Design a protein around this ligand. Structure first.
Ligand SMILES: *[C@@H]1O[C@H](CO)[C@@H](O[C@@H]2O[C@H](CO)[C@@H](O[C@@H]3O[C@H](CO[C@H]4O[C@H](CO)[C@@H](O)[C@H](O)[C@@H]4O[C@H]4O[C@H](CO)[C@@H](O)[C@H](O)[C@@H]4O)[C@@H](O)[C@H](O[C@H]4O[C@H](CO)[C@@H](O)[C@H](O)[C@@H]4O[C@H]4O[C@H](CO)[C@@H](O)[C@H](O)[C@@H]4O)[C@@H]3O)[C@H](O)[C@H]2NC(C)=O)[C@H](O)[C@H]1NC(C)=O
Ligand SMILES: *[C@@H]1O[C@H](CO)[C@@H](O[C@@H]2O[C@H](CO)[C@@H](O[C@@H]3O[C@H](CO[C@H]4O[C@H](CO)[C@@H](O)[C@H](O)[C@@H]4O)[C@@H](O)[C@H](O[C@H]4O[C@H](CO)[C@@H](O)[C@H](O)[C@@H]4O)[C@@H]3O)[C@H](O)[C@H]2NC(C)=O)[C@H](O)[C@H]1NC(C)=O
Ligand SMILES: *[C@@H]1O[C@H](CO)[C@@H](O[C@@H]2O[C@H](CO)[C@@H](O[C@@H]3O[C@H](CO[C@H]4O[C@H](CO)[C@@H](O)[C@H](O)[C@@H]4O)[C@@H](O)[C@H](O[C@H]4O[C@H](CO)[C@@H](O)[C@H](O)[C@@H]4O)[C@@H]3O)[C@H](O)[C@H]2NC(C)=O)[C@H](O)[C@H]1NC(C)=O
Ligand SMILES: *[C@@H]1O[C@H](CO)[C@@H](O[C@@H]2O[C@H](CO)[C@@H](O[C@@H]3O[C@H](CO)[C@@H](O)[C@H](O[C@H]4O[C@H](CO)[C@@H](O)[C@H](O)[C@@H]4O)[C@@H]3O)[C@H](O)[C@H]2NC(C)=O)[C@H](O)[C@H]1NC(C)=O
Ligand SMILES: *[C@@H]1O[C@H](CO)[C@@H](O[C@@H]2O[C@H](CO)[C@@H](O[C@@H]3O[C@H](CO)[C@@H](O)[C@H](O)[C@@H]3O)[C@H](O)[C@H]2NC(C)=O)[C@H](O)[C@H]1NC(C)=O
Ligand SMILES: Nc1nc(=O)c2nc(CNc3ccc(C(=O)N[C@@H](CCC(=O)O)C(=O)O)cc3)cnc2[nH]1
Ligand SMILES: *[C@@H]1O[C@H](CO)[C@@H](O[C@@H]2O[C@H](CO)[C@@H](O)[C@H](O)[C@H]2NC(C)=O)[C@H](O)[C@H]1NC(C)=O
Ligand SMILES: *[C@@H]1O[C@H](CO)[C@@H](O[C@@H]2O[C@H](CO)[C@@H](O)[C@H](O)[C@H]2NC(C)=O)[C@H](O)[C@H]1NC(C)=O
Ligand SMILES: *[C@@H]1O[C@H](CO)[C@@H](O[C@@H]2O[C@H](CO)[C@@H](O)[C@H](O)[C@H]2NC(C)=O)[C@H](O)[C@H]1NC(C)=O
Ligand SMILES: *[C@@H]1O[C@H](CO)[C@@H](O[C@@H]2O[C@H](CO)[C@@H](O)[C@H](O)[C@H]2NC(C)=O)[C@H](O)[C@H]1NC(C)=O
Ligand SMILES: CC(=O)N[C@H]1[C@H]([C@H](O)[C@H](O)CO)O[C@@](O)(C(=O)O)C[C@@H]1O
Ligand SMILES: *[C@@H]1O[C@H](CO)[C@@H](O)[C@H](O)[C@H]1NC(C)=O
Ligand SMILES: *[C@@H]1O[C@H](CO)[C@@H](O)[C@H](O)[C@H]1NC(C)=O
Ligand SMILES: *[C@@H]1O[C@H](CO)[C@@H](O)[C@H](O)[C@H]1NC(C)=O
Ligand SMILES: *[C@@H]1O[C@H](CO)[C@@H](O)[C@H](O)[C@H]1NC(C)=O
Ligand SMILES: *[C@@H]1O[C@H](CO)[C@@H](O)[C@H](O)[C@H]1NC(C)=O
Lengths: 404, 137, 358, 97, 49, 48, 49
């Protein structure tokens, strides 16, 4: 910026290595020297994808019979299948669909180790009592979602034409669950754990007969003794049955074989792209790297081979082969710069010129912009390492000189 | 390489400029240290080392074989990972990591680079060789 | 609900003789973590030729575990009589995080035929039977060991050729020597080798049918079978529970000659397992054909940090229990089985509360 | 007697190996710290972006950034300390020659 | 309701710009305008910055 | 001693291993410093 | 732990962890500096003796 504020000169910081140097010093005037700059990034030339392809995730049990009460929720656990949320959701009139610790876009598109679906009858009038912040009966004694896993909660009404789902006589829930200790003085509330059933489920019937019904069981010494007690309460049944659906997903306890259904192309195979930098998605595991055919190591049944830094370094493919996975290694770049001549050369340290006057191979890597002179210096200002020196021509190209 | 992260990284000011400049300065200091040290070990005058140097005194382990025998033994007995100054980039693609936790192949993965020393081996040997030949006189 | 075959039609159960004294043996086989005993392999991945620490469910180093042994029943010549068992059905344990089982460790050794201490025989591997559930109490006569509501039963059958896993309500039968009837001692399963262990056609329902004599199976949600190839190889079995259900682990399908356990099944059991017991088993062999059966050992699991040594082929052959002692802590802090000589500070010996004040 | 002296009882020799080990430790810090999550759901920025939307995605990425910035600052500080140390030490070698 | 700005501030602060997006919307679908929503509205119709 | 904290502490990698090893090394250096110093103050010969 | 549930409890514990990790790093860094300093100084004492 000039004194009058106009921009008369600028540097495009990503244009080349010299431009990167000026931007890192925020100056159009930098000193002579040999500077490390951003590496030349390798870019993917393709992608590889492997997913379980087969049976779809079966939501049939959900659609048949009378759904359970909130404290008796039924659980469907999906592994090794192709899931489709729309195919479930389209059957219901969805009133509420919110997600936590996972985006809305992700819940329908990501691969999971498992997907757990908890379904039950639930009055929409008690919507707020399924909130994580709730301190009412439902979150305390009936149903609570996990805090450690990503979850979604869906509340939906069963359409009049979905005649395979029948209604209970009323909605019901536990409003009290506690233990009376053997002293018969102290009462201890028994709170439901996330993703678990309340301990009072064994004393509370599938439907609470009347609001205020009280239940009790004598506990054995093995159970700590004392009594387990509970009270139930009810909500009048609505015109159409209202249901809650809790979805919990896990991302890495197994091969993430719970995926969206993907139509595969033969340009996303590993064998067809060996030696290339590709993006990969292997049963939910993703990143960038280079696949190579190599000797099998690790346990075959476990599919993914990791190193000591927890990087994926090997993979057993469904094609029967074992591949080594290397990162898409970048090419080192150093700028050799002469302030007096305003000239420069690029050093690709530890790189053979096979990957780069043209390129010149030196003991410290490949240089571009230096001319081999078979000249000796003692007074070196731009040492390249070993006993090499960049020697400005003064302007022309920098010469590659040896230090005597 | 994630643009979203880079956007957030910018909120920390010129962080990477400070990292790069600090290491650049440290690396220059190392080259100045070497240049200064060897300028002082350097003899102004020295006798040629010939086989038999030492006479009755057996100094053959100090004579250049070039590095001396004791010097080669010192290096051979120390476990040093080869940084691959000329083509380590390629060695780590064609052969891969030498072992678990290979910190040389990690260079091109983690985003760091080991730089070569100011002097090569033959030049360093030349300085200690000429130093040896100067001791008696 | 799942059809699990017909009910027993017998009016009475076989009398069960409980003589715990005969089963009070001391044959310790503590977990030796340096041999990777009781280790469940990292579940979603493998490693090759490295040593790392890992957090997971492991047995404690040095844990002796609970030993259980099955025996031949009573007999007079060629006619088997009543069953002979230990007091295992009343010995209800807390499940906690699950357990691992050392099976057939004594196989091929010469041991004792429990029912007749003076008689020795070559030891053969026998598989453990378990009853697991969320609620326990007593039977009609006051004896402990009744499970309520849905109970998970892991019952090996076919003379050790299949594992049958089912989740069902156990409704005790009221016949003679049955849990809801008269002269009840303990329920037990059994098989009769003379008719059940033919060289060709094994009776794959022998232990199930005997189980059914004591209990009616009602409201079964599943019944799964897994096939076991016969051998005398030491193997490990494990059970844990998560939100996904009950996970069954075994070494025999992946690391048969090693002992690392890998998951082979997941059961749709979502109620929390809090209690388990060993279902006693008695073999109705004739008096002249009694076998010695290997004892099995049950070890509890807990969330521990272990140092795991993965071989090139990925199996864990050596490990350190990082919390066992101070030396183990040292090896784990360096992630190595080889550390230098020296004097090292390690975690302090923690004081624990011996009570509370309010 | 010195020809066979490069053993574990030779303190000068062990110091040579220690200097080499210190170089390796400096690099191991950079290499191993990238696997840390620093409280984040993943050490992979790509996974965070894959799973979360911006209001939460930023928070998770920011954890990785602060962790990695801390690592780089620690690395640089140790290189500056080790460099200064070596520079002093180079003077000492000069004096001994 | 406000997000990333206080209620007191929305009516009192200076802005470079203020953008007002208005539309017909049933109150019965209130929850589907939430940032956490995975329903039709936040996915295909309207989403706030 | 809180298990919940320890679970979260593990997300920071081998943090405590680095703390312990760094201090161990520093403490060894101090012992080497003392051993070396006193080896040199030590006289070969002395009068009572 | 007594007052909060996991989604908030973790955040509060994490503040204490980061604070304490920072303290330990600072402590170690100063012990390394003081140790190096003393080691140099031990050489100086050697020379003066
Ligand atoms: C996840 O799960 C969800 C839910 O299951 C999947 O979403 C469904 O995806 C299918 C496609 O795979 C989609 O089907 C399409 O429907 C439209 C709508 O047409 C309806 O209305 C017209 C009115 O004129 C009717 O004539 C027509 O029959 C349909 O009527 C429906 O409803 C009435 C009751 O009101 C019933 O009586 C009817 O029987 C019927 O159910 C169709 O227009 C569309 O047709 C095109 O595609 C089919 C593919 O088989 C093709 O055969 C047709 O000839 C036509 O194709 C031509 O046109 C397309 C451009 O549109 C062009 O691309 C082609 O090349 C041809 O030129 C089709 O049938 C269904 O609606 C979706 N449902 C929901 C809820 O989203 C989702 O795909 C799953 N995801 C994954 C990954 O698996
Ligand atoms: C988890 O598992 C436990 C243990 O099995 C179950 O608890 C048992 O529940 C049954 C009922 O299903 C109890 O058995 C009897 O229930 C009768 C209920 O009366 C109604 O139903 C009968 C028809 O069955 C009608 O004729 C009657 O008019 C009522 O409509 C009781 O009346 C019975 O009482 C008898 O025994 C008591 C002593 O215990 C005597 O005082 C009575 O006079 C009478 O003789 C009897 O209780 C069974 O006892 C319960 N067991 C235990 C240990 O409590 C849980 O229900 C199950 N949980 C779930 C969720 O499934
Ligand atoms: C009771 O007695 C029975 C014998 O009657 C024992 O059973 C044997 O147990 C041993 C040890 O577990 C088994 O030996 C292993 O066999 C594996 C496969 O064998 C087949 O394939 C090889 C060729 O690869 C053939 O030569 C062989 O004939 C078979 O067809 C090998 O792969 C194993 O080697 C692996 O582990 C060892 C040890 O760690 C490593 O050194 C090797 O490099 C390699 O990784 C091993 O040799 C033997 O096969 C079993 N025999 C039978 C009939 O089952 C029971 O174990 C014993 N029970 C108890 C409790 O002691
Ligand atoms: C040994 O144990 C096994 C369990 O491991 C046990 O297997 C069960 O056998 C029964 C048959 O006796 C199976 O029940 C059938 O399943 C088919 C499924 O296609 C149904 O179609 C059958 O329905 C007809 O028969 C019914 C008879 O009750 C009629 O009521 C009905 O109207 C039909 O005519 C029937 O339900 C059962 O599925 C298997 N279970 C398992 C888990 O495999 C076997 O019976 C046991 N053997 C002995 C001798 O006890
Ligand atoms: C000056 O000193 C050097 C040693 O620093 C002498 O050289 C050594 O001579 C011995 C002769 O006994 C060599 O021993 C041999 O070693 C080989 C194995 O490498 C073994 O196979 C033979 O049987 C024998 O034991 C020794 O290797 C050699 N060392 C070196 C570094 O050369 C040299 O002879 C001395 N010169 C004079 C004039 O005294
Ligand atoms: N029917 C039957 N089943 C068996 O399992 C059985 N086992 C034995 C032998 N059992 C054992 C088990 C361990 C040791 C043993 O050598 N233990 C060591 C101590 C091991 C330790 O505590 O570390 C010892 O010296 O006693 C001996 C015999 C004998 N008869 C049997 N009979
Ligand atoms: C398994 O790991 C060991 C190291 O624990 C590897 O052994 C090293 O191999 C290199 C290269 O030949 C040698 O320079 C080292 O001296 C060896 N170290 C030891 C302790 O032996 C072994 O090669 C690896 N095996 C495989 C198949 O990768
Ligand atoms: C079942 O038998 C076992 C083993 O004999 C009993 O457990 C022992 O109980 C005595 C005290 O009476 C202790 O001194 C022993 O150390 C215990 N042994 C073991 C291995 O724990 C058990 O109490 C009996 N249970 C029932 C219901 O009779
Ligand atoms: C177990 O399954 C039975 C059906 O086989 C359920 O229904 C009862 O069945 C018995 C025996 O036929 C009848 O006497 C009852 O009247 C039936 N009750 C009802 C409500 O239909 C039984 O409810 C199931 N038990 C459990 C705990 O789920
Ligand atoms: C488990 O083992 C049983 C018994 O060998 C297998 O059942 C046999 O299957 C074959 C092939 O269909 C039939 O010809 C036999 O008649 C069956 N025998 C019996 C007793 O049913 C069963 O298929 C095996 N299960 C698995 C998963 O391998
Ligand atoms: C548990 C028990 O009572 N065992 C007894 C057995 C059985 O009565 C017979 O094996 C019946 O088949 O008989 C013995 O004489 C024996 O064989 O040593 C005494 C032994 O104590
Ligand atoms: C139910 O299906 C019939 C056709 O069989 C249709 O006329 C009716 O409108 C449908 N009801 C609803 C609520 O969609
Ligand atoms: C590869 O995919 C193309 C369609 O794009 C198909 O025509 C071809 O036959 C496929 N070849 C193989 C080997 O699958
Ligand atoms: C990988 O190498 C093995 C030999 O070790 C060979 O059999 C296999 O066909 C090769 N796979 C590919 C894709 O080249
Ligand atoms: C420069 O040329 C000479 C021959 O004149 C050759 O020996 C030397 O290796 C060359 N230098 C480089 C870096 O290629
Ligand atoms: C347990 O024993 C008591 C003895 O009074 C008996 O009343 C009770 O019914 C028994 N429990 C069961 C489940 O039968």
């Amino acid at each position: 910026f000039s004194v009058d504020g106009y921009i008369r000169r600028a540097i495009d910081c990503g244009f080349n290595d010299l431009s990167q140097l000026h931007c890192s010093y925020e100056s159009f005037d930098v000193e002579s020297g040999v500077y490390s700059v951003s590496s030349f990034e390798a870019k993917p030339s393709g992608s590889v994808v492997e997913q379980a392809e087969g049976v779809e995730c079966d939501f049939s049990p959900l659609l048949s019979g009378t759904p359970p009460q909130v404290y008796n929720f039924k659980r469907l656990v999906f592994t090794n299948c192709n899931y489709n949320l729309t195919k479930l959701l389209s059957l219901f009139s969805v009133n509420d669909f919110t997600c936590s610790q996972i985006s809305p876009a992700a819940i329908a598109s990501n691969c999971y180790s498992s997907l757990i679906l908890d379904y039950f009858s639930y009055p929409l009038s008690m919507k707020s009592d399924l909130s994580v912040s709730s301190a009412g009966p439902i979150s305390q004694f009936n149903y609570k979602q996990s805090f450690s896993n990503p979850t979604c909660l869906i509340l939906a009404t069963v359409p009049h034409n979905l005649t395979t789902i029948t209604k209970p006589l009323k909605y019901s829930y536990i409003n009290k669950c506690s233990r009376l200790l053997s002293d018969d003085r102290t009462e201890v509330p028994q709170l439901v754990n996330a993703n678990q059933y309340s301990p009072c489920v064994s004393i509370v019937p599938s439907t609470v007969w009347e609001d205020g019904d009280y239940y009790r069981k004598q506990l054995s010494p093995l159970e700590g003794g004392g009594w387990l007690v509970a009270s139930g309460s009810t909500v009048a049944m609505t015109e159409q049955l209202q249901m809650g659906f809790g979805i919990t997903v896990q991302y890495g306890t197994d091969t993430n074989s719970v995926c969206p259904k993907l139509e595969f192309a033969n340009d996303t195979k590993i064998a067809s792209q060996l030696g290339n930098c590709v993006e990969y998605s292997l049963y939910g595991v993703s990143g960038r790297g280079v696949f190579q055919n190599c000797t099998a190591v690790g346990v075959r049944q476990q599919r993914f081979v990791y190193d000591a830094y927890q990087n994926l370094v090997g993979y057993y493919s469904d094609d029967g082969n074992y591949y080594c996975l290397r990162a898409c290694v970048s090419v080192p770049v150093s700028v050799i710069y002469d302030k007096e001549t305003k000239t420069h050369a690029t050093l690709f340290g530890s790189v053979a010129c096979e990957h780069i006057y043209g390129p010149l191979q030196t003991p410290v890597g490949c240089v571009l912009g230096l001319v081999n002179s078979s000249l000796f210096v003692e007074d070196c200002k731009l040492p390249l390492g070993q006993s090499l020196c960049a020697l400005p021509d003064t302007p022309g190209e920098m010469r590659l000189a040896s230090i005597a | 390489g994630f643009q979203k992260c880079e956007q957030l990284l910018r909120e920390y000011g010129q962080f990477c400029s400070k990292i790069n400049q600090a290491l650049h300065g440290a690396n220059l200091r190392q080259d100045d240290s070497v240049r200064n040290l060897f300028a002082s070990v350097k003899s102004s005058q020295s006798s040629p080392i010939i086989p038999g140097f030492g006479g009755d005194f057996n100094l053959t382990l100090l004579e250049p074989v070039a590095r001396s025998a004791i010097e080669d033994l010192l290096f051979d007995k120390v476990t040093i990972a080869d940084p691959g100054y000329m083509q380590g980039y390629d060695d780590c693609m064609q052969q891969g990591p030498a072992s678990a936790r290979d910190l040389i192949c990690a260079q091109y993965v983690a985003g760091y680079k080991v730089l070569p020393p100011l002097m090569d081996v033959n030049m360093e040997a030349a300085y200690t060789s000429s130093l040896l030949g100067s001791i008696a006189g | 609900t799942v059809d699990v075959g017909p009910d027993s039609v017998k009016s009475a159960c076989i009398e069960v003789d409980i003589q715990q004294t005969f089963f009070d043996k001391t044959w310790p086989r503590p977990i030796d973590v340096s041999k990777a005993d009781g280790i469940i392999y990292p579940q979603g991945r493998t490693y090759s030729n490295i040593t790392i620490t890992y957090q997971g469910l492991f047995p404690y180093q040095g844990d002796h575990g609970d030993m259980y042994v099955y025996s031949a029943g009573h007999a007079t010549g060629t006619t088997p009589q009543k069953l002979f068992v230990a007091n295992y059905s009343q010995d209800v344990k807390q499940f906690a995080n699950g357990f691992v089982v050392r099976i057939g460790a004594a196989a091929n050794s010469t041991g004792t035929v429990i029912i007749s201490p003076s008689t020795s025989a070559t030891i053969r591997k026998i598989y453990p039977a378990f009853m697991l559930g969320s609620s326990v109490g007593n039977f009609s006569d006051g004896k402990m060991g009744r499970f309520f509501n849905h109970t998970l039963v892991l019952l090996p059958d076919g003379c050790g050729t299949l594992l049958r896993a089912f989740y069902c309500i156990l409704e005790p039968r009221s016949g003679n020597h049955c849990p809801a009837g008269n002269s009840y001692t303990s329920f037990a399963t059994y098989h009769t080798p003379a008719t059940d262990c033919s060289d060709g056609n094994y009776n794959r329902n022998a232990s199930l049918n005997s189980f059914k004599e004591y209990f009616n199976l009602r409201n079964c949600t599943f019944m799964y079978t897994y096939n076991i190839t016969e051998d005398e190889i030491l193997e490990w079995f494990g059970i844990t529970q998560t939100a996904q259900g009950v996970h069954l682990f075994s070494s025999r399908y992946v690391d048969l000659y090693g002992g690392n356990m890998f998951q082979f099944a997941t059961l749709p059991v979502y109620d929390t397992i809090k209690y388990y017991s060993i279902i006693p088993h008695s073999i109705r062999s004739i008096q002249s054909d009694r076998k010695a059966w290997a004892a099995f050992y049950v070890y509890k699991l807990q969330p521990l940090t272990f140092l795991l040594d993965f071989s090139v082929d990925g199996y864990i052959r050596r490990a350190i229990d990082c919390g066992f002692n101070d030396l183990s802590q040292l090896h784990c802090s360096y992630e190595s089985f080889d550390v230098e000589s020296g004097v090292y500070s390690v975690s302090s010996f923690e004081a624990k509360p011996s009570g509370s004040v309010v | 007697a010195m020809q066979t002296g490069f053993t574990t009882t030779n303190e000068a020799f062990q110091k040579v190996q220690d200097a080499v080990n210190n170089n390796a430790q400096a690099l191991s810090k950079l290499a191993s710290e990238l696997s840390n999550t620093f409280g984040a759901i993943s050490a992979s920025i790509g996974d965070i972006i894959q799973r979360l939307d911006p209001p939460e995605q930023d928070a998770q990425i920011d954890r990785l950034i602060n962790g990695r910035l801390t690592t780089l600052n620690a690395f640089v500080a140790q290189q500056l300390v080790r460099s200064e140390s070596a520079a002093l030490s180079a003077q000492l070698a000069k004096d001994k020659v």
